[PDB]
Design an enzyme around this catalytic site. Structure first.
Site, PDB file in Angstrom:
ATOM      1  CD  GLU A  27      -9.767  -1.285   0.129  1.00  0.00           C
ATOM      2  OE1 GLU A  27      -8.614  -1.936   0.757  1.00  0.00           O
ATOM      3  OE2 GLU A  27     -10.202  -0.359   0.863  1.00  0.00           O
ATOM      4  CG  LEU A  80      -0.598   2.406   6.572  1.00  0.00           C
ATOM      5  CD1 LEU A  80      -0.393   3.317   6.050  1.00  0.00           C
ATOM      6  CD2 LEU A  80       0.076   2.347   7.965  1.00  0.00           C
ATOM      7  CG  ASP A  94       0.771   2.957   1.206  1.00  0.00           C
ATOM      8  OD1 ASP A  94       1.994   3.374   1.398  1.00  0.00           O
ATOM      9  OD2 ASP A  94       0.010   4.508   1.899  1.00  0.00           O
TER      10      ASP A  94
END
Ligand SMILES: [Cl-]
Ligand SMILES: [Cl-]
EC number: 3.2.1.17
Length: 307
Positions: free
Chosen positions: A156, A177, A165
């Site tokens: 990632e 997040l 994002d």
């Protein structure tokens, strides 16, 4: 293997460029399966032979291909798929393709049958360009050690500043997040929340690994409250547990829970049948490199694909 291929290539690129400038330059090292491919233009045959000894001094190298000429770009996933129509997505995942100068090199671990097929398809896509095949048929502990944090670093990324994002939200670290609001200030405050200081939209690696632990704990609770994921998770060793946590990070609890047949095979320890099956899903199609590492982790129960 991901980390060693890159680690060695750079050390060879950098120690080699040093020797050249002591006699602007052009050297490139590509690493696949610990086999190494040397590319570039050198002036004399003796220097080309010396750069080859640099590579062969890498104790962790199990092959060295010296294709430096005596006086580039790796193919992306889609460009390979345009070129290998007819081959299964699984077999396409065991292949690297590079074009340096007017040559095209094809690396991979293939069956003799698969070699002739892919060699054909590449030769017809490039036309009358030279095509070099570098196929393999179907102690060393100084390298970085792999763990679940380094696993999802490779899959990632590690970001130390607040970034947007793809869904239009704000995030930091490894996919942690902060908020779906387009208010950055809202994200910066929530960033101070989990860290408990004046982050200022910036964090250190030590306190990004602290977030990643909170995210891992959160997943493992969703996993143990989901009727389909819990028994599989309990039955698996530590590495295979991080493979499952990887899929959850990527698709969420409900997403993973839909892999009914592959889950029954993992709980049954049928590692190889579970791999053939997971390589048939949309997951493999849309993230083949990752799914190839995640699936090998399930098959070996080790950090091979990532080391
Ligand atoms: Cl792509
Ligand atoms: Cl991928």
């Amino acid at each position: 293997m991901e980390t060693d291929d890159n680690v060695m290539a750079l050390r060879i690129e950098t120690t080699a460029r040093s020797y050249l400038r002591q006699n602007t330059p052009q050297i490139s090292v590509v690493g696949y399966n610990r086999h190494l491919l040397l590319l570039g233009q050198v002036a004399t045959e003796g220097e080309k032979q010396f750069v080859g000894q640099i590579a062969r001094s890498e104790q962790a190298a199990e092959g060295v291909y010296n294709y430096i000429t005596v006086a580039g770009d790796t193919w992306n996933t889609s460009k390979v798929r345009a070129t290998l129509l007819g081959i299964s997505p699984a077999t396409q995942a065991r292949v690297k393709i590079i074009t340096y100068g007017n040559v095209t090199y094809v690396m991979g671990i293939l069956t003799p049958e698969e070699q002739a097929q892919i060699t054909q398809k590449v030769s017809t896509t490039v036309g009358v360009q030279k095509v070099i095949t570098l196929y393999q048929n179907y102690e060393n502990l100084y390298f970085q050690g792999m763990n679940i944090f380094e696993m999802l670093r490779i899959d990632e990324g590690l970001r130390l500043k607040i970034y947007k994002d793809t869904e239009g939200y704000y995030t930091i670290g490894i996919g942690h997040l902060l908020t779906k609001s387009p208010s950055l200030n809202a994200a910066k405050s929530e960033l101070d929340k989990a860290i408990g200081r004046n982050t200022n939209g910036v964090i250190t690696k030590d306190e990004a690994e602290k977030l990643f632990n909170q995210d891992v704990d959160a997943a493992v609770r969703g996993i143990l409250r989901n009727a389909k994921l819990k028994p599989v998770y309990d039955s698996l060793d530590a590495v295979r547990r991080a493979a499952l946590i990887n899929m959850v990070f990527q698709m969420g609890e409900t997403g993973v829970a839909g892999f009914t047949n592959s889950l029954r095979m993992l709980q049954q320890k049928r590692w190889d049948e579970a791999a053939v099956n997971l390589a048939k899903s949309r997951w493999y199609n849309q993230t083949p490199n990752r799914a190839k590492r995640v699936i090998t982790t399930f098959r070996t129960g080790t950090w091979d694909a990532y080391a």
